[PDB]
Amino acid sequence: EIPKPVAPAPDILRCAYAELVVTDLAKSRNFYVDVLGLHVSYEDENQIYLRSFEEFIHHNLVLTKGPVAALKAMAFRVRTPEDVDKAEAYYQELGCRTERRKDGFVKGIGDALRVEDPLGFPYEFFFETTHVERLHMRYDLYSAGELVRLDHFNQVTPDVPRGRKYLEDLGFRVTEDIQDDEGTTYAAWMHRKGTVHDTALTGGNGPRLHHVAFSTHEKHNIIQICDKMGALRISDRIERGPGRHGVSNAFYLYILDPDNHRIEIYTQDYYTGDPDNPTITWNVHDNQRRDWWGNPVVPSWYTEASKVLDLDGNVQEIIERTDDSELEVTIGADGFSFTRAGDEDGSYHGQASKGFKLG
Template sequence: MAETPEPMYELAHLGHAELLTPAYDRSLEFFVDVYGLDLVHESDGSAYLRAWSDHDLTTLKLTAADQAGLGHVAWRAVSPQALERRVAALEARGIRGEWIDGDFGHGKAYSFVSPSGQRMELYYETEKYRAPRGKASYLPNQPQSSVARGVGAARIDHINVLAQDVPAAREFMSETLGFKLREHLIPPGQPEVGAWLSLMNKAHDLAITKEPAQATGRLHHLAYAVENREDVLRAADVFCELGTDIEFGPAKHSRTQGFFLYVLEPGGNRIEVFSGGFHIFSPDWEPVTWTTEGQGRSTAWGLDVPSSFHSHATPVLP
């Protein structure tokens, strides 16, 4: 019997992401008034935001830029020692990043570019959110009151990035950082076009899907979670009432089994409202291989996928 590789639990979760936008004022208005995040700090052309159930001070950095896209995505280590070990593993793999002093809300971080072209950071030190008067919950185990604006996004959930070589990208994330492959999509006679990975027991913290163009480093979408399916349905009404066009959903994903809704924020980045998704408690989970979208049903319940979902990503190509 082949020896089972020791699972690696040195990164804890998706910590924060930076989105670039060419429409800073309108994007900020969207994330605060429509998506329902709180603005906690603004300086030097960037806004720092949080969702009401995020335990860290900030999970989204919104930065003014010439074009939309991902500035960086950051993963939090489980300890300072784990951070040092993962940096050593990256450098042993030939990755040459650099230590940065940190940013608003978090301490020093190791910044590097992944093989698929996205800038990533690893860090441990973070500032916890302490609710001011008027925002504290009656529940002491909840970071903030759940009384929310707009969609009322609850917490950062996952990110989907594009890669020219999906297997190589997910193998890198697994072997150096400890991501576990949960599901992947391999159409008959074609290479792998999608992989869904997680760090602990979620269905996914990271999705890697096939880049449709000759480009690297692009973002497919960033997702925040809400508490339940009804909140996703309510989000659809909120978007319609407040003038945000719905691209896709509400519906249920086949992979992850999450309930979803996608829109484009004013800068052009795709944003998801997500709920549910299965959880993994088995230490010897066997990755599920899909051969078609939804076993021939497109999505789990048969809703067709719009063509824009496969073609649009940020930065938008000429």
């Protein structure tokens, strides 16, 4: 169990950007810029810095050339410069590796702290950042599949209740989670900015990065990404969706970048900013919890996630989940899912919904 420090937590505003290592920068550029239409704040031959349509801070995504594709840093912005110091004291009290760089780790970011957190994740906290031209009314640039904000991260970790307590001490508020009747937690969502989440925990072998998610304005914008990938004949890179989420109620799509880093596109979740925001728990066997329409969850969605790096640039060793597997208990050979609680009609035994089994 991760202890609550005496030191006060930093005041986290929101997820702000992710730094991903990619193996072929030009190919990653094609994906994020030519396919997805993200905007370039800066680039050279080792790094592409990218922002969403509505962003005013320097970037939401840094692509860094490197030998092994992995998450290099998930960054959260904090309220004040003093919160970066608060974050340092907090994590040092946790006994975690910290690195402070007064002019930051990537361009466009100032004084920054990176930590190897209790769950083995490279987190960054910073306040100082270079303001750029906010493109929110730049409809001359607006794509039919326009990504407008960065919404959240999703982390794979073996012991969700352990991680959850830690993120709660750190100030994140749990909004929705998935459990069963035997006390196992499979996933939790938690926020700071007043949307359904800024980060989430998905149970599995970790530390691994499940995905980074971007918002669009409307549902048809997500459809268009799909239609565009069809025209470019890269529909094999649509992993799962599009659909309506049960948890979070967002319209959604999951796609895979050239290094298999998973990107979610997401719109129209709900407001969570009140402190007594009602929490929602779904049962793991509820076939509407992930896809509200009952469409089957793709097995790669449960098994695949990106490596994460430590502060030396080396891959974190993965620890295996010993809690029950969401995959096994829902769509595996001994799995079960229902459409209506207690109704055999519209239930699935030992297979996925809509007539499929695992390949």
